[PDB]
Design a protein around this ligand. Structure first.
Ligand SMILES: Nc1nc2c(ncn2[C@@H]2O[C@H](COP(=O)(O)OP(=O)(O)OP(=O)(O)O)[C@@H](O)[C@H]2O)c(=O)[nH]1
Ligand SMILES: CN[C@@H]1CCc2c(ccc(O)c2O)[C@H]1O
Lengths: 51, 231, 281, 329
């Protein structure tokens, strides 16, 4: 069980950030790349190769 | 412009080959071989012969293909979802190992197999192997089924039994108790979509390859009868 | 009066057949070899209920045929064609069930989507060959004076035939596809009883009416609808002044109603119920 | 050796200290995406039995699929015509992959072997052996090295040229069912049958983090486009979004009227929509930042087992046990 204790020790010394910053980063990314996903925004049929 | 023509030609060739492959795919019947340890599964497959294993055998111009899985051995079974389109499942259990409990473990495995959500419409062919070790243990044996299986005390032989000539009543009682202990689980939640076909086999037995044929024919006939609302 | 009843019959015949055809066409899970025969049967019933019933009703109510002789002959041809194409399909369905049950290991090879089309086309060719060929040609015409007098006029369209055609068409349409159906369903009943006996012997202690009910419904509706007419058809030709025209027309119209019952008999599976619930519901 | 409980309590308390606010509180004034309706554009037929896997090409044009009749067919989505058809030695296959360079195709199955095929030569090029259980997934890390996950609770990083395992990853208790690679192909995640997902380092070969949200087997795992989050789907009819930096989950996606399992999970280009396949014969479209359903993808007559989104995010493909592939847009 020495390996298990060593692994738990390794995964306890990490640098964590508050989840507010993580949520802000996710929202910023989603808003920044929101105009370049054809599924979310229906593009005209001229640019659709499946028509 | 010629690229479309070349693609169409390749498509035509591929569809032509798939047409030939479909016939042989529909012709064959697939079986799954599943048994616990020390059952006598290797002897059974060897006598039909004369992380996976495949066996071809043809009976009366019908192609049967049987699979044995040995590479993946665990109490948890996640690969069992892949076998929901087989014709039948062959279950091999050692009848004489009621004290070495192994029989209870086999019963639990059968109960788990029967009630799986993906195996709702799959029948089971049951082979109760080792018919001579059981006879030796029952006739003039120190051990008795009473201690290991307390329900045996109040069990009576059914009046419809057809014993083989010359065998004692005691071995008949033991054999029929073991068979009904599986039939009780089989009949509880069948709902008419799938049945169980119990058999008695041993080392010197030459009709098993015909028994599988007959059972598969019965399975298909019953399925077709039920589909048309006649059974 | 009777107009309401005839309109209701026409609507009932059209609605069920159209619904069945659309349900088979729209969903790909119903595209099975067995469902091609049902499609052909539905096509025959729809054509009959949309072509021959309305004009026959108009002729009965008006008591005078207001179309030319050519349209009378064309109507008779369509009537015979549809009637004789709606029964051989039932025979084909019965034979398919026979093969499925009695030969389970060879059913896949025997029947293929290519062979079903050939069988259907042969059935329709044999059907239309006995209807248009001896009616557009005047081989079916009678000889007595009433027949000639009605043929001359352009306002009466009645069915007058000789003995040979009245026997041959009846044998082709009804009597041949009856013995086959009887034999097939008897064998199917025997197989069902044999299987039920095995189940009872094997596991009866822990635990033949469904088959009887289903076969009874299937055979009884067909025999009751089409049997009396195909006896009086021979009868009124063997000896005259025996069957009145009114009884002949009544039994003939009783036969037509069988087209409104086929969807209620051959399309009762749960898959068809799901299909009918998905659309128009 | 009972000190492990103290370590687990310390980790749990450290994680709970960072929970300043929920994701829903942060994302509460964002306007919803509204109803999203997609209709089938193509339908591909030709598989004799049920389909277990598919994988889009990097050109957003070709794709590969695997079925239980033992055959791999390479399609052409634009012109819905077949290009290749490879028969297989063993007819039980559970996964397939398509090389980033478009030159190779891999497949594994119930036999404990991963096989690769040379498309531009179609014959077997290599066979990788060493796993003691069935393969669940495989992904081409490069044109020479591949990472695979197996049912013996291990993952390996293979070398195609020599055919020998280079690195072995251990630490799961139950069967490993899926994996996904980061966009930079430096770290990958996996989901096991002990209801736990782990983060692995490819170069070093050690586990960095562990996530313990789900209560049942994890069938599918996907990776956020940013590279700092991932989503998993399990048998308890829930999808959970975790986070690498914060080291705990942020949101759960579930509805009270659904009680079936989940077989596949995928994201979109922006990551706003999360697409998940279910056992209820259909697929659902979620809102990643608000946890609200935004559409249904119905039309399959059997359970959905595969799901994928193109590199340019033009279309989504679904495979099912009905032996049909459908393209949605
Ligand atoms: N007397 C007798 N011996 C049997 C019978 N069936 C199997 N055996 C013997 O049991 C021994 C062990 O069975 P094997 O078939 O070798 O293999 P196993 O140990 O059952 O495990 P499997 O390989 O899974 O069958 C063999 O030496 C067989 O000869 C039987 O019906 N009667
Ligand atoms: C005008 N009604 C016709 C007359 C004779 C006839 C019918 C149907 C099938 C036949 O084989 C027939 O000979 C009837 O529908």
């Amino acid at each position: 069980a020495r390996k298990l204790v060593e692994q738990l020790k390794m995964e306890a010394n990490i640098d964590r950030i508050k989840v507010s910053k993580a949520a802000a980063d996710l929202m910023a990314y989603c808003e920044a790349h929101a105009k370049e996903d054809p599924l979310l925004t229906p593009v005209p049929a001229s640019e659709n190769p499946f028509r | 412009r010629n690229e479309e023509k070349a693609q169409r030609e390749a498509n035509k060739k591929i569809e032509k080959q798939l047409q030939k492959d479909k016939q042989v795919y529909r012709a064959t019947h697939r079986l799954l071989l599943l048994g616990a340890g020390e059952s006598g599964k290797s002897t059974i497959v060897k006598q039909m012969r004369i992380g996976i294993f495949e066996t071809k055998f043809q009976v009366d111009k019908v192609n049967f293909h049987m699979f044995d899985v040995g590479g993946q051995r665990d109490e948890r079974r996640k690969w069992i979802q892949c076998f929901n389109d087989v014709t039948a499942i062959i279950f091999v259990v050692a009848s004489s190992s009621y004290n070495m409990n192994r029989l209870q473990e086999a019963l639990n495995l059968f109960k788990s197999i029967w009630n799986n959500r993906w195996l709702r419409t799959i029948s089971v062919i049951l082979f109760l192997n080792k018919q001579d070790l059981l006879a030796e243990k029952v006739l003039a044996g120190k051990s008795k089924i009473e201690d290991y299986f307390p329900e045996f005390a109040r069990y009576t032989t059914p009046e419809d039994a057809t014993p083989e000539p010359g065998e004692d009543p005691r071995v008949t009682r033991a054999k029929y108790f073991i068979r009904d202990e599986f039939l009780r689980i089989s009949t509880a939640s069948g709902d008419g979509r799938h049945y169980c076909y119990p058999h008695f086999t041993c080392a010197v037995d030459t009709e098993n390859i015909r028994r599988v044929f007959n059972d598969c024919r019965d399975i298909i006939q019953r399925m077709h009868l039920r589909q048309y609302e006649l059974l | 009066g009777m107009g309401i009843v005839m309109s209701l019959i026409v609507l009932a015949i059209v609605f069920g057949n159209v619904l069945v055809i659309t349900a088979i066409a729209k969903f790909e899970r119903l595209q099975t070899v067995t469902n091609y025969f049902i499609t052909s049967l539905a096509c025959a019933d729809l054509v009959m209920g949309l072509a021959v019933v309305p004009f026959g009703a108009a002729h009965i109510l008006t008591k005078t045929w207001t179309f030319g002789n050519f349209w009378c002959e064309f109507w008779t041809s369509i009537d015979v064609l549809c009637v004789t194409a709606s029964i051989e399909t039932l025979c084909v369905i019965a034979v398919d069930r026979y093969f499925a049950i009695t030969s389970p290991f060879k059913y896949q090879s025997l029947l293929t989507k290519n062979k079903a089309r050939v069988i259907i086309l042969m059935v329709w060719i044999v059907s239309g060959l006995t209807s248009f060929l001896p009616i557009q040609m005047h081989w079916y015409r009678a000889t007595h004076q009433e027949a000639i007098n009605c043929y001359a006029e352009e306002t009466c369209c009645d069915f007058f035939t000789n003995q040979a055609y009245a026997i041959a068409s009846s044998i082709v349409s009804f009597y041949v596809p009856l013995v086959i159906m009887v034999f097939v369903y008897s064998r199917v009943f025997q197989e069902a009883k044999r299987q039920l006996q095995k189940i009872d012997k094997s596991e009866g202690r822990f635990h033949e009416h469904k088959a009887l009910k289903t076969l009874g419904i299937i055979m009884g509706t067909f025999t009751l609808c089409w049997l009396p007419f195909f006896i009086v058809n021979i009868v009124h030709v063997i000896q005259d002044n025996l069957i009145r025209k009114e009884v002949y027309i009544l039994l003939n119209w009783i036969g037509y109603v069988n087209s409104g019952f086929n969807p209620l008999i051959y399309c009762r599976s749960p898959d068809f119920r799901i299909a009918f619930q998905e659309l128009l519901c | 050796r009972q000190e492990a409980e103290q370590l687990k309590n310390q980790i749990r308390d450290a994680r709970k200290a960072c929970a300043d606010a929920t994701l829903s509180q942060i994302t509460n004034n964002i306007d919803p995406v509204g109803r999203i309706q997609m209709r089938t554009r193509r339908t591909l037929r030709g598989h004799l039995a049920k389909i277990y896997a598919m994988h889009w090409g990097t050109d957003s044009r070709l794709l590969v699929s695997a079925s239980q009749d033992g055959k791999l067919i390479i399609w052409d989505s634009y012109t819905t015509n077949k290009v290749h058809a490879i028969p297989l030695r063993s007819s039980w296959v559970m996964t397939c992959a398509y090389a980033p360079s478009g030159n190779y195709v891999a497949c594994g199955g119930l036999d404990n072997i991963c096989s690769i095929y040379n498309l531009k030569t179609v014959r077997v090029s290599r066979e990788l052996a060493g796993h003691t259980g069935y393969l669940s997934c495989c992904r081409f890390l490069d044109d020479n090295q591949i990472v695979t996950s197996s049912g013996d609770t291990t993952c390996a990083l293979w070398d195609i040229e020599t055919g020998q395992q280079t690195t072995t990853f251990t630490g799961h208790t139950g069967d490993v069912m899926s994996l996904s690679l980061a966009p930079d192909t430096r770290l990958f995640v996996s989901g096991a049958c002990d209801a736990s997902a782990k983060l692995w380092d490819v170069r070093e070969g050690m586990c960095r983090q562990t996530f313990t949200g789900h209560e049942s087997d994890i069938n599918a795992i996907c990776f956020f486009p940013n590279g700092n989050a991932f989503a998993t789907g399990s048998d308890d009819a829930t999808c959970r979004l975790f986070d690498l930096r914060a080291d705990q989950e942020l949101m759960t996606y579930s509805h009270d009227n659904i009680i079936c399992g989940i077989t596949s999970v995928s994201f979109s280009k922006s990551g706003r929509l999360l697409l998940a396949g279910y056992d209820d014969f259909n697929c659902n479209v979620w809102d990643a930042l608000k946890a609200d359903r935004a559409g249904v993808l119905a039309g399959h007559d059997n359970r959905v087992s595969c799901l994928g989104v193109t590199d340019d995010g033009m279309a989504v493909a679904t495979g099912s046990w009905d032996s049909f592939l459908k393209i949605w847009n």
